[PDB]
């Protein structure tokens, strides 16, 4: 970004999600003037962010444990999904931290009976790596969202759908976020840049990872 910061003079940085607005001047090494955000002044509530730490068993839940199965958390997750599929109107989406999380959890969700129930209520439309199938899924999600039978679109927090696709009145009602998207599931490349993030900048491991994790967490909810 330095050359365009070297080249261009009057630039604006704007998003629905930018948080914190200071991590960017730190990493990108640039000067700002009005790092100003605005609150939502409403005459009504209009949305519900909730922290489901616990399940019915009052059990703390996560995808940080593994990218795997632990029938307690999985069935707890299966219980939360099936009841959300019962309550939200047409248009509901969720965001796994990782696709390999999605693939493992979903496969053995069809193993139990959790998938048949949501199949009674709504349509279920998976996110496939080939996006023609994903596109064929997404539009049929929106079409079913604008149609009667509920449409459920399940994707990856780091996947393609979160980048540009919007969820309107009907195309999105209750977003969910199963665990927090993290990447040290994979190898040490983040560690290396994070090390650089640690040595070149005064940015720790967890503060960087939680910032990115909540950067895409914020990216999905809006």
């Amino acid at each position: 970004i330095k050359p365009v910061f070297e080249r261009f003079s009057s630039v604006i940085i704007t998003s629905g999600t930018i948080s914190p607005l200071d991590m960017y001047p730190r990493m990108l090494n640039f000067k700002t003037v009005l790092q100003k955000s605005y609150a939502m002044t409403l005459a009504k509530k209009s949305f519900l962010p909730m922290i489901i730490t616990k399940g019915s068993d009052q059990v703390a839940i996560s995808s940080r444990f593994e990218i795997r199965n632990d029938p307690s958390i999985v069935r707890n997750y299966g219980s939360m999904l099936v009841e959300f599929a019962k309550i939200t109107p047409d248009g509901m989406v969720v965001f796994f931290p990782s696709y390999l999380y999605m693939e493992s959890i979903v496969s053995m969700w069809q193993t139990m009976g959790i998938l048949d129930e949501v199949w009674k209520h709504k349509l279920i439309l998976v996110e496939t790596p080939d996006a023609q199938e994903t596109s064929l899924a997404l539009e049929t999600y929106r079409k079913a969202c604008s149609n009667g039978r509920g449409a459920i679109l399940l994707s990856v927090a780091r996947g393609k759908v979160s980048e540009g696709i919007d969820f309107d009145h009907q195309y999105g009602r209750t977003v969910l976020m199963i665990g927090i998207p993290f990447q040290y599931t994979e190898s040490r490349i983040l560690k290396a840049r994070l090390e650089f993030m640690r040595e070149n900048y005064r940015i720790r491991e967890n503060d960087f990872l939680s910032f990115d994790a909540m950067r895409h967490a914020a990216q999905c909810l809006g």
């Binding site: 047409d90 149609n147 009145h169």
Partner: protein, 351 residues
């Protein structure tokens, strides 16, 4: 603090003639536990109440009744100006339990063709009380909504505690684009008031249609009771009516004649349309410190009006809800009652 309306944008035409055809849901979702017995049973209680209300304020109209069971809609009372047929039909249904899915495409499809015989002067209408959250469509439903909106059959539906975009759309589509017709409850009384409000004619902004002059005549009661005899039931009725044109003994009914087929009415039905057509102006709540009128009511004599300076009690409000065209005070009771049963503004009548 007041919860009163600003302005009515439709006293001009009401749909005085009607063919309203109410359809129910006897599906599994009616067996869930939100409404006191369930959805299924307490819904039916208020429908009975509406049935009585719908024919009292629109007695010239008819209705049919359809249930929604097992992905199959099932007519249970034919489109009739006789409520008791529907009332008795409703009495049997609650004794059966709701089941299966609501297949709206079924229910819409039979509703649309049921109203074809309903003429141009009579108004086609459908009232869906939807309470489940999924459907099962035998065909294209947009085909049917497109077919429905084509047949001049407006649709207002009352969803349960949820909002569904298709019936958002359906009420939007049929009702001339003017989506005002997927109003939904949170509450039994909200449901109760959801039922009572569906009785009056439904004008929003009427398009110019053929205003057709309607030829009828009026029946007259029979006297001889030992001559108990009927041409509309072929039984021993101790005295009925006689159509002005057919000349056949017809039992007491606003029902059409069964021998020459002209609508039989005495006088009473149209005057409900009058106060339907041209209602009054709302009784204005007079300002507390600017009223200075008689310390009583007008339609009744309600000496309670204030307490004359009580710091909080007097600075609140002066119970003087007064109509405008008469400029006569009315206690809220009268002001409510005047606006409740007899439109007939007491001050505006006497001048």
């Amino acid at each position: 603090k007041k919860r009163t309306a600003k302005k009515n944008i439709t006293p001009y035409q009401r749909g005085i003639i009607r063919s309203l055809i109410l359809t129910l849901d006897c599906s599994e979702a009616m067996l869930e536990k939100d409404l006191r017995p369930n959805r299924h049973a307490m819904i039916i209680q208020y429908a009975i109440d509406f049935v009585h209300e719908f024919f009292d304020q629109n007695p010239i109209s008819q209705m049919g009744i359809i249930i929604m069971r097992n992905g199959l809609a099932q007519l249970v009372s034919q489109v009739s100006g006789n409520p008791q047929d529907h009332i008795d039909a409703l009495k049997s249904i609650r004794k059966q339990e709701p089941k299966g899915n609501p297949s709206l495409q079924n229910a819409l499809e039979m509703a649309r063709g049921l109203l074809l015989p309903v003429p141009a002067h009579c108004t086609r209408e459908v009232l869906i009380v939807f309470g489940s959250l999924s459907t099962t469509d035998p065909g294209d439903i947009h085909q049917t909504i497109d077919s429905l909106v084509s047949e001049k059959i407006r649709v207002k539906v009352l969803g349960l505690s949820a909002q569904v975009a298709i019936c958002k759309e359906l009420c939007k589509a049929t009702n001339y684009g003017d989506e005002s017709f997927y109003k939904i409850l949170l509450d039994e009384t909200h449901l109760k008031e959801l039922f009572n409000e569906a009785v009056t004619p439904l004008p929003v902004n009427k398009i110019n249609k053929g205003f057709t002059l309607v030829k009828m005549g009026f029946p007259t009661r029979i006297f001889e009771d030992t001559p108990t005899f009927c041409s509309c039931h072929s039984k021993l009725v101790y005295g009925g009516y006689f159509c002005p044109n057919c000349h056949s003994k017809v039992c007491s009914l606003p029902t059409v004649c069964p021998c020459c087929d002209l609508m039989l009415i005495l006088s009473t039905h149209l005057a409900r349309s009058y106060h339907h057509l041209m209602p009054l102006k709302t009784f204005a709540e007079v300002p507390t410190t600017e009223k200075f009128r008689s310390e009583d009511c007008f339609s009744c004599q309600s000496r309670f009006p204030x307490x004359x300076x009580x710091x909080x009690x007097x600075x609140x409000x002066x119970s003087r809800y007064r109509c405008e065209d008469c400029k006569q005070e009315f206690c809220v009771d009268c002001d409510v009652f005047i606006h409740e049963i007899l439109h007939n503004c007491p001050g505006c009548e006497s001048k």
